[PDB]
Every structure is written in C-alpha cells, then in structure tokens.
Symmetry: D5
Subunit: 186 residues, 10 copies
C-alpha cells in the first residue's frame, strides 16, 4: 500500500460551498487532510458515505482536519448534485473533480476498466505522509466514526513521540511506551 508515503503534487477544480475553487497539494501542507474517494456522482452508496462525513465535518474542522471528496466526475457535476440532493446539500467541504484521473492515479486508486475511483479513504498528516488507508468493495459502505477514531490516534501519536496507541484506543486511554523492558511482556 501507499502507507507511510508522501502525497504527490496535484491541481484540480472543486466545488466548495457555492463556489468553484482550485485545490493543489499546497493547500494540504501544514494541515491534516482526508482524501475521500468514491466512484460516481448521482449513485447510491456514495451519497450516504459523503453525508456521514458531512455529519462529522464540524468536529473534523475543530481538530484541524480538512476533507476532500474525489471522483472522476467534474466540479460542474458536483454542483448539480449538491443542488439536487438533500444529503449532498449538507456538504461544506471541497468536492474535487478528477476527470483526467490524475489525482486518483496518484493514490493508485483507479478502476482502470470503469474510469471510476474505488472506495478508498486516505488520512494525510501535515508533512504529507499517509497514516491511515481504508478501501472497501463497491457494495460495502465506510463508517465515519472509525475514521474519526483513527484521525485522533494519528494526531495523538504525532504529538506524543515515544508512545503508540494500542488496538481499540480512544481519547483518554492507556498508551504503550516502546522500550527494551516492554519486549515480550504484553
């Protein structure tokens, strides 16, 4: 996988809160970023996942986390979808259009026989390093609550070097501090 690799440069048009904007890797530098890939606008599993991310967007913003949804549809289609669907209408984050497929291919996430992105989510730190990846099949929906758990653990580990978050770790729980002494004890 692309775990522990730096994101590549990109330049794309996006729809964000009634305006068209340009997004590049420079917008991600010094921020926490979620790249939320999905196959197509005006489809079925796709809106439900985007709406669930929209429900956590206020908290994600409080934690310094930007969200970028991405599909191979244009930014024009994203606006039409935002205006016609009550689930998409609640999106306040940038909806990137990747019709060249370049951003999708930067993340090795193209379904090359369909020209659509796979259901992949990537957590990117302020240095551009990918810290968490989740990929699901066409029919399996992703859950924003587990993404939030992971973002919080990735933020804790960044702030507490020398510590690690064990399995099932949540805010305000015991962390392991790797040492020679701890080797073979757990």
């Amino acid at each position: 996988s692309l775990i522990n690799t730096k994101i590549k440069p990109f330049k794309n048009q996006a729809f964000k809160n009634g305006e068209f904007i340009e997004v590049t890797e420079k917008d991600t530098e010094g921020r926490w970023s979620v790249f939320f890939f999905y196959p197509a606008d005006f489809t079925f599993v796709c809106p439900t996942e985007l709406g669930d991310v929209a429900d956590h967007y206020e908290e994600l913003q409080k934690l310094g986390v930007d969200v970028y949804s991405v599909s191979t549809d244009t930014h024009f289609t994203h606006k039409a979808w935002h205006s016609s669907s009550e689930t998409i209408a609640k999106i306040k984050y940038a909806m990137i259009g990747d019709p060249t497929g370049a951003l999708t291919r930067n993340f090795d996430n193209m379904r090359e026989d369909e020209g659509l992105a796979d259901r992949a989510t990537f957590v990117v730190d302020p240095q551009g390093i990918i810290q968490a990846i989740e990929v699901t099949a066409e029919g399996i929906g992703r859950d924003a609550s587990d993404l939030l758990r992971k973002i919080k653990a990735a933020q804790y580990v960044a702030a507490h070097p020398g510590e690690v978050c064990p399995a099932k770790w949540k805010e305000g729980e015991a962390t392991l501090a790797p040492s020679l002494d701890l080797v073979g004890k757990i």
Copy 2:
C-alpha cells in the same frame, strides 16, 4: 490498492494450536479469509491487535471466516511468542511465518528498508477476491469490531448480488438497491 483483485498463490509454514503446518492458497479456496499482517513478534502494538482478533475468533469461525496472522518472523518465533505472552497464548488461528517476505509482497505490504510487513488487514472471499483493506501507520492500532462489520457487509453483498450496504450499515439495517430511479434521489 489490491481491492477486487485475486490473491496470489503462496506456501508458508505456520504455528496453529500447538502444531506446525503448511498453509497455501488452496486452503483459502471456498472460504472467507482474513490476512492480518503486522511488523514483528515480541513488540508492543502487535499483541493488542492480535489478542483483540482472538476475542472475536469464535464469532468469525461461526461466520465461516479463517484468520491468518502474518509477519516476516518464522513459525518458530510465533510458537515461542505464543508460549511466553498471555495475550498471544489465546490465539487459536494460524500464525504464518513469512521469512522470505513472499506472502507480504503478494499483498504489496513490505517495508523494504525494514524487512517487516506494514499493519495491513485484507478480507478475502471464497473466490479469492479481496473485498476490504485496512492499513495503519506504525503507532495506530486496528479495531476488530470494525473488521467484523466489514466481513458481515461483505457476506451480505455476496449473498444479495443486486443490493449494496450504505455507510454505517449493520446486520438488519436498510440496504440500497442500485437502479435508474434511485439516481440522485438519496
């Protein structure tokens, strides 16, 4: 990612419930499989994740799912770890040794500069197709309850071809049926 691709052939030695055995791709044919990769035996986050999977192993076996944990350590080391850790001692699934790194590379999961596998989990169906992938960075532990939810959704979609599981789908909740009429109405 390797999403919706077929697993590659392999032949590895494993430690399983007090004995050494060979595991190959033919042992996965006709069953649901979890390939759970981790970097090293006798470390820190690794046992909490493996123990957490062992706590759900009776439910996974009730669902027809086999677990294979994998690291680049040998099956001898897995056995020793199983005898010295209270957490590893509760594993009743196969602990695969991948000292050549071939199983890890099949899954494109090697840290080549370390000779250790990344913290990657793959859900593979009875036809050898990868249906869900999760990868986390060195200090971020995985959560088996999310793994189980994804296996159940993967089992549902395989059992109901014309249906899809939306975001946050749990057993019994409202599914979606992709069609011309559902386009843009969610």
Copy 3:
C-alpha cells in the same frame, strides 16, 4: 484525420428515454450513425448543441440515422441532466457515458489535459466508415442544418456510385460524373 477509416469496436452504457442501455459497434452495423461529442454535462454551449440535434431528430430517424451523443461523464449524470434541464429532457436519442475515455480515444478526440472530449461530430455509414468530420473550439457551437446537408450528400454518394456531390449540394441539384473527358473541363 479519421476520414474514410473504420470505427473501432466499443462497449459503453447510455441513457435513452428513461432507460439505461448498453451500446456497442454491433448496434451501428447496417445503420447510419452520428457520434456527437461534447465536453461536459451541466455546462453552457453543450445543451444548446444537443437541443439543436434533438430538434432535427425526427428527420434523422426518417433517413435511417441514429444519434449517439458522447461525453466523459457517466450515464447516471446524463439521466440526472435529462431530469434537470428542459433542453436536455427533449433528447430522445442515446446519451452515451464514456468515463474510461475509450470511445473518445477511438475517435482521437480526447483533451488529454482535461479528461473531456472536444466538440466533434462524426458521420458513420452502415459499413462503419467515417464520411464526415466537424470539430469546433470550446466556445463555438455547431449547427445541425450543416450536419443534415452533409448526411444527405453522404447518402446520395453511397446510393449512386460513379457520381460525386459538388460544393453546396442539396437534394435535386446537379452532380458530377468523374471521368477522363471531364479532367480540367470544369
């Protein structure tokens, strides 16, 4: 240019009169076809051109000519645009979705830096041979009265071998008979 070349095989999904269908080269065998490329759904020049073709569609169906509009948007987007716009709602011909860009690339008509097709029209005969090409710039709209004239002249030449349509040919006007005696006489 691709003039007097055979169309390449293709398999694409499309929206046509409230139903999703599959279109291939096999569906064009034995018929006259108009492949009407345009850059993107939900834009400005594209619907006016698509409406202009729709206006001349009864006349085209009487002449045995099938219309296939094409863009790199999906068929789901075409269905949504059909429901959203009164101009597009009057289209009774097949709206092909080409998210892979393959059908666009068969006609060497991709804007490779944009992932959008250019404004190009191809007249294709019952034997798969391109008999007329028209490409205009992003801001210049095409005119169906030109397309129909060229279509009728294409139909005359095929139904009358040994004759050729001179400049400004309309039904009932004089035609040339290529021969040795006529060389340099016009």
Copy 4:
C-alpha cells in the same frame, strides 16, 4: 483532432494572381487563415469547392481572413490549372503546392496510400491556433457559407472573452456567459 493546437512551421511555393511566391508560418502571424486542402488539380469536386471559396473571398478579405488552398501538386500545376479552367481562373488567393506532403502532414491530412491530401479545412487564428476543422469524403463537397459562419463565431469569441457562441450563432444573436449560476440552468 488538431483542434486548439498551434500550426507547425512550413515553407512552400505557391501561385497567386499571375506570380509565384513563397508562403511560410511567418506570413500567417497576426492574421486569420483558412487552409483549404483538396486531393488533386484537374479533377471534379475540387474546382467547385475552390470556386465557392473564391466567391466568398471579398467577404473574407474584409474580415482580415487569408485563404491558402493546398494540394500535393506543384505550384507549376496550379498556374496551368488557373490558365486552363474558368472556375480556377477566378481564384485571387494563394494556391500552395505541397509535393513533399509536409504541409499536409503538419495537419495530419495525408491519404498515405494515395499521396493526396483529404478534403479538410482549418480555421487558424492570429496566434496560430486552430479554431475549427471540417473533413468530408472524396465525393462530398464542402460549403463556404458554413466556413464563414464558423469564422465569424471564431472572431466573436476572440473579441469577447468571457462569452461563448451557442449552436446556430449568427451576428446579432444571443450569447452565453459561462458561470457557476448558469451550471445546469439551460
């Protein structure tokens, strides 16, 4: 197609109003140009098309548009054809000779098995960018009224940036202003 590409440099001899001249890309800098390709001197469809362009030549010179007809015959042959035919004797524009096929190949317009150019027309702006393309089959003649309409729309779009000519645009008719508010409103 070559739409929205820059013309390549060239150096060809030509016949123009009783004199032989050299034409290069430098002669088209700062002017609007029509490259009118045709297969061969002393044929049948070619003079009728060339005569039709000659008829609209005063109107083209008023709009700052230069005409350059092209074939793989030499300039000596164009001079002889000018003297031989009453249709060709009325041509006041430059008749380029392209025996090397280089100018034809710059426009990807060679019939490689015949050594003759196809019936293609290119509208080129003062900056060397192709704004309109028309290719017809050996027996189908082109119509200059179409060329002039496309030329006028090309001139409008360049002289009015931020506007676009919709389908069937004539001088005095309404134009669209691409914006976010207009996305999916037409």
Copy 5:
C-alpha cells in the same frame, strides 16, 4: 548504384493515348523497359527530353522496348499536360503518375526535400535486371540517341553471351570475346 539489380514490384496509374491505365511490374516481365524519371509536369527541360524520347518511340517499339515516363505528378496532370503542350501531345508511351513517391523510391531516385524525382533513366531487361543507368543534374538535359545506343548494346550482349560490346560500340561493329588468351593483349 542499382546496376545489375532486379526492379521492385509497383502499382501505379498512368495516362496512355487518351486513356487511364494501371501499370505494375507484371507489364514489364518479358519486355525491355525504359523508366524515364523527371521532376515535374508543366516545367522546362522535362518536356524537351520527353519529346526526344517520343521521336525514338517508333524505333524503340520495333526493338521490343517499352517506355514509362515517371514523375510525382498525378495521371490527371499528365493528361492536362498532354492536351495543352504540342511536345507532350506527341507522346504515345505511358506517362506514370507517382504521387506516393513509391516507384521513385524503388529506384532510389527521390529528391526528398522537393518531393520530385531526379533526372534519371533506367534500362530494364526482360528478367527485370537494370542494365544501364543515366542521372543528370536539374539543368542538364539527357540525349535519346545515346540511350538508343545503350539499349542496342544491352540487347546485343543478351543475345550473344560470351561476347561484350567495347567502348563506342554501334550496330555492325567488332565485339570482344573474353578469354584467357585475350588477357593483357588489348
């Protein structure tokens, strides 16, 4: 040079005595053939040479010799030239058109920067073997009388194996009969 090599296959259109015909290498098999290349129709040195060949054509035919003049002009241009020039009007041999340049390139005789053939003449025997080559610069005219001398010597040598025609040989003169005895005597 191409001396003593077999001619290559070719297929070209030609003007011959008021008709258009196809010429291939099969027309040359079992005959003596002269391939008379020249740069362009409607030029200056070119007609004078072709007319001088036309003056010897009756005798050439009496000797079983066919003539094929060749330029990169079309067979249509050859007809126009035949009708408009009193020198070309006297040509009774085939005037081949080589607009693809293929026949010219078979004989390594293209001026690649001009797309015109050089002033080259080739004498080909009934087995397709090139027995005499003459090439001159753009401004130097060829003389049919020396070509006739050469054809007659090539025919004599073919009929009298074991003999050779020395320098300046003409019909009814002494020939050398190569032998060991003759070595060093002349």
Copy 6:
C-alpha cells in the same frame, strides 16, 4: 543516386605518368573531376573505355577537367598494365588503386560479391558536387563523346545560374530560362 551530393574524403595511391602519387579529395577542390570506375586491370571492355577517355584528355584538360580512373587493383598493377598495353600506355591521367574498396564504397559502386567496382562514371564540380552519373552493365562499353557533352552542359549551367540545357544541348544551341511564363508553353 548520389546526384547532387558532395564527394566524401579519400586518400589513395595512384600511378600517373611514370610516378606514384597520393590523391585525396583536397586535390579535387576548385576543379572539375571525372571519377571513371571499372572492374579490373588486364581485362577486355575496360581498356577500350580508358583509351577512349585518353583520346579526349587534351580537350578535358583545356576545359579545366581532371580524370581519375579507379579500380580495386593496386597502383602497382596499373603501372604494369600501362607498360604492357598500347592502349593503357596512352593514359596521362591518374590511375587510382583502391584495394581497400573505400573510394568505390564512397561512390556506392562496389560489386560486394566480386570485390570489383561497377562501370560507373561521375562528373564532380569544383565544389565537390556530383552533376552527372552514368553506370552500365559488365558488357556495355561507355562513350566519352557523351561524357564530354555532359561536362560542357554542366560547365554552362554553373556559369549561367538562371539557365538550363534542354535535351540534345550542344555548345551554342538554344538554352531555356525557367520562369512563370514558360510553364506549359513548350
């Protein structure tokens, strides 16, 4: 052919009027040169052609023309031939030896399966440009009176850049002046 190409550098030993000398391309700079190739010393057609050239050598020297006869034999063999043949004894021009075949290959005149040069003659001007080429088969002797006519025409055209020598042109006869008016009037 090598018509209108520049001669390549060479360095060869020669026999000339009782002495051995080196001849290079620098010895041709500023003069008219005849490279007269033949297959072998002590043979049959070769001496008649060489003797015939020697009979015109005073006129050629009066015209500023140097003669170089060439074969793949050595300069030693040329000297011996010159001492034993009454015909070769009258040669006062350089007899070049080309045992390596390099001078012959420069002129693309080697029979590779024999190690002998073909019966080829090249006329080279003071700038090293080949202006006339003649090649004949093994048994067909060349005629020096035709060679002289071609040198004179080559000298005239070099001395009168805007003029050309038509077919059968001799010193003093009517020349042609290429222009727009002369096109198709001969």
Copy 7:
C-alpha cells in the same frame, strides 16, 4: 569464496548485554571481527555453537576480537531468546538482527528460498579483509577452539609478514620462511 575480500558497509540493530545498539562497518574498523551466521532463533536444537563462542568470548576479547552473531530474525527476537534460554543467556557479544537480509547477502550467505542465513563463520582483520571462512551443514558442529586457533594464526601472520603458518600450526611451533631455496625442499 569471499576469502581475501573486503567487507561491505552495513547498518543493523542488535541486542547486546541487555541493551539495543546500532552496529555498522565503522564499528569493525581497526579490530578483529567474527561474523557468526546461523539460520534462526527459537528452533528446537540447543544452540551449542553460539554457547561455545560465548564460553571462549573472554579469550577472544583479550585477543582484540569482537563477535557478531547474525540471523535474519529481529533484535527483539534475540532479546527474547536471550531471556528464555540458559545457553543464549551466556552471550555477552552483539546479536545482530538482519530482517532485510542485507548483511547476510553481503557475505553471500542467504538461503533465498528460506529467507534464512547459512551456518557460516567469517574472520575479518583490522583492515576489513576476510582471512578465514567455515561453512557447515546442520549437525556438523562449528568448534570455537578451532576458530581461536585460526584467529591466532591470522594474527601471527599479520604481525610477521615474510612468515607463513604451516598445517596444524599453534603458538610456539615453527613457521616457514617463503624463499627460493625452500622451493621443493619440504
């Protein structure tokens, strides 16, 4: 073999006397070193060979010899092995972990189908040159007292250039002085 070659650079982690350290080729500069390779930790066989080197380690350190045992297991596994086994607990020299196989491949000692090192011992001098090598199959014991003898002989020849140690040489025994008069004398 690698006899008389220089060791290659390396950088590995190790377990040494209760602490984790980094070892590189720079730690070997100016010292005598022993690289002691073995297939795997935690196997069922008693590690007598490693224990036997530990029994001789005080004497080796008196002779300025550093010991590095190497396997493809991690330094975490070595520490666990050291805590679990009485034989391994005697080890006071560095236990290098080589999970990438890179130190093992530098000594051309990898079993590529297993991902384990062979049972090879290399004696390295202060300039990095390999002076002795021993490789045995499983069950063929490597004797540490034969290793000490070899090291002592290597140290003797380094301190007495011009002398060589014959078969069975030990401190106090006679050496040979390579000379011309000694040729064929033993």
Copy 8:
C-alpha cells in the same frame, strides 16, 4: 557459499600412486569425497597441509572417504613433485591437475589475478552434496584432525537425521 549444493561435472587428469588417471564426477558417486585445493606445487604451506592429509589417509579410507588434492598445475608437475619431495612422496590419494581452472571455478575457488586456487577444502557426500567448506588465507595452514572430526560428524548426521 556453495554449502548444500551438488558438485558440478568435471574431467581432469591426475597423478596417483605412480600412474596417470582420469577423475570425473562419476568417480565420486556413492563415496564421501574431500576436494582439497591449494595454490601451487613446489611451495611451502601446501606440502605441510598435503602431508598432514596423507598422515590421515589410511583412516579416511577406513571411513569410506576419498581425497582429491587440486591445484592449477598439471598432473605432470604433481608427478615431479611426488618424486622430489619427501612430504609429497607420502601421498597415496589422487593429485588432480587443473590448468584450465575449470574444476577450481566449479567450486568458485580461483584467485583470478594469480591463476591459482585458494586454500579451500570441500567435504562432499555420496549424493554429491557439499556438507562442509573451509577456506583460509595464503598464510594459514589447515588442520586435518578438524577435517576428520567434521567428516565424522557429517557421516553421523547422514546416518541419524534429527538427533
């Protein structure tokens, strides 16, 4: 290293007990073999090492073990050395000549800048598998008692796998 690999085919001339013989890999089949490489005849460490192996040859032959000494010199040179040196005169095993260096290179044991073999000993089982390898520097002689101990260990593990 070449540990646990099968020896490669070879064909060489040798001197043995006053006669010249040909030795190939077919002569090693079903026998335990010692390929004992050394750099050059008429030198110094080489005879002491070869003499030490000759002192243990009777014992090695009691263990079913054949010995082949190998250098890049010819079998002609080995015969001369056997007649002129008292140490070499004790050798009753085959002295293989390897002037092409082919046998030396099969064992990857050539000092390519000298055209001489390195001081390497290979223990080879009845199936052609290399079970023990020892290589020492130019100045360090090998010990035949250590070679015998390893050979006895190799035979024990062959007879009793897993103990």
Copy 9:
C-alpha cells in the same frame, strides 16, 4: 593463432598452368595443402619466396602437397604477372585471386587499412586442420626448405600417433614416445 583449427569454406578463381580454374575447400579434402599468402603482384621486389616454393614444387607434389598462393589481386593479374616475370613463370601451382578478401579473412590474415594480405604460410592436413604457421615482415625471407621439413614432420606425426618430433627433427632421426616414465627425464 589459428593453429589446430579447421579451414573454412571458400570459392575462388585462380590462374594455374595457362588456364583459369575454380578452387574450393572441397579441392583440399583428403590432401595436404599449403596456403601461401603475399601482399601484391607486380611490386618492385623480386618474388623469391614464390619462386623458391616453385623450385620445391615437384618434391611437394611427390609428398601429396598442393600449393595455393594467395593475394587480393585478381586471377587476371596473376596471369599477366606470370607472363611478365621469369620467377613467376616457373610457378606451376594454383595462383588464387582473392579480390573480396574472403579467403584472406578466413585465415585472419588481412591488413584492413591496405586491402592486402600479410606474408603468412599455413600448412593444412587432409582433414582440414592447420598444423604449421609462419608469418614474417617484409625482407624476412620464408625459406621453402624449412617449409618442407615442417610438412615432413607433420606427415610423420600423422602416420605415427603416439610419437612426437623433437626440436630439429629430420627423417631418420630419433623421436620421443610421450609416457609417464619420460616425465622430467629429458
């Protein structure tokens, strides 16, 4: 050198006792042959070496040895040389002409910068194997009596396998019998 290699196939013309013949490797089968190379005919030096082989030619033929002298000159030149020189006139063996250099290159005996063979002699046995070679610079005479001695020794060893001819061996002298007991005895 080419010692103990087999001769390669060849096909050359030759001068032999007033007639021209063809020589191939098949003419050498079953015979002893001498290939006697030399740079050139007709040079100023007296050809003593060829004359000396001619003085010994009756004896060589009695010994079943055929002689072929070879130079890169033609067989025509050899015949002329044979008529002009008293030394060469004594030659009754075949004088091979090698103008392609192919027989000379088979014996790796070409001076590539000269196109002449070196002064090399090769003795070839009835199976085509080269048994003796002698190469000298100019002025270092090749002695035919040393050539006879060498041939006699080669014939002796062919007829007495198991015997070798020592230094200075001649018919009647003692030979050596390669054996173990003879090792170090001479």
Copy 10:
C-alpha cells in the same frame, strides 16, 4: 595474425640463473626479444626445443637478443625443472611463469580447452613490433637455426630498409 603489432604490457615472475625476477614490457624496450611459448614443464618436445634455444643463447646474446621462454606453469615449477633435468639445467635465459594466461593471451596463444600455451615463437624488435611469428602443432618441434636466420634477416632489414 599479430604480425607488425606492438607487444602489450605485461608483468610476470620468472626464474633466471638461480634467482626469481620480475619481467615486464619495460625490460624488452631497446632490445630484440624472442618470446618462446611451449605447453608444459616436465614433458617431451618442450625440453628439446628449449635446449636447442639454450645451445644458441650465447650467439643470440652476441646479436643483442634476449630470450623469454613462456608456459602457463609457475616460476616455482620452472626452478624445479631447471634443477631436475640436464637439458633445462643448460638454460641461462629467463623462464617466465604465466599461470593467469595473461601473457599467453596477449599473444593470442592459449589452447583454451587445455590451459596451456601453443608452440609459438614471436620475434620482437627494439620498438616492441612483432617481426616474425612461427606456430607448430603439438607434435612438431621448432628449429633454432631457422629462428637465428630469421632474426639476422630482421636485423638486416631494420638497419638497411629497402635493399
């Protein structure tokens, strides 16, 4: 062949008059040299040929000519052969050892399937140019009187070019 080419640089050990020396191409500069190749020490044609060159060495040294015998054996082997054979004991010129075959291959004179040099003699002038080459089959001995005659001829043409 290598006729009229310059000899290539080399560095080899040799036995000469009871001592071991190093010979390189720098030792041949400004001297006439004979490189005399033979297949193997302790054999048959080789000593008769080497002994015949030894019989003419005093004369060759009077002509300013140095002799270097070369085989793929070591300089150690040449010393042993010089002590054990009465024929070799007469040699006062350098016996070069060529175990890497590098000097043999510079003269393109290796029997690659034997690792032995062919019976080739090269006459080399003071500028390093090869002026005469002679090669004979395994069973045919060379004649030193013919080598001397050619050397005298080479010296005459060097001193008097064009006669």
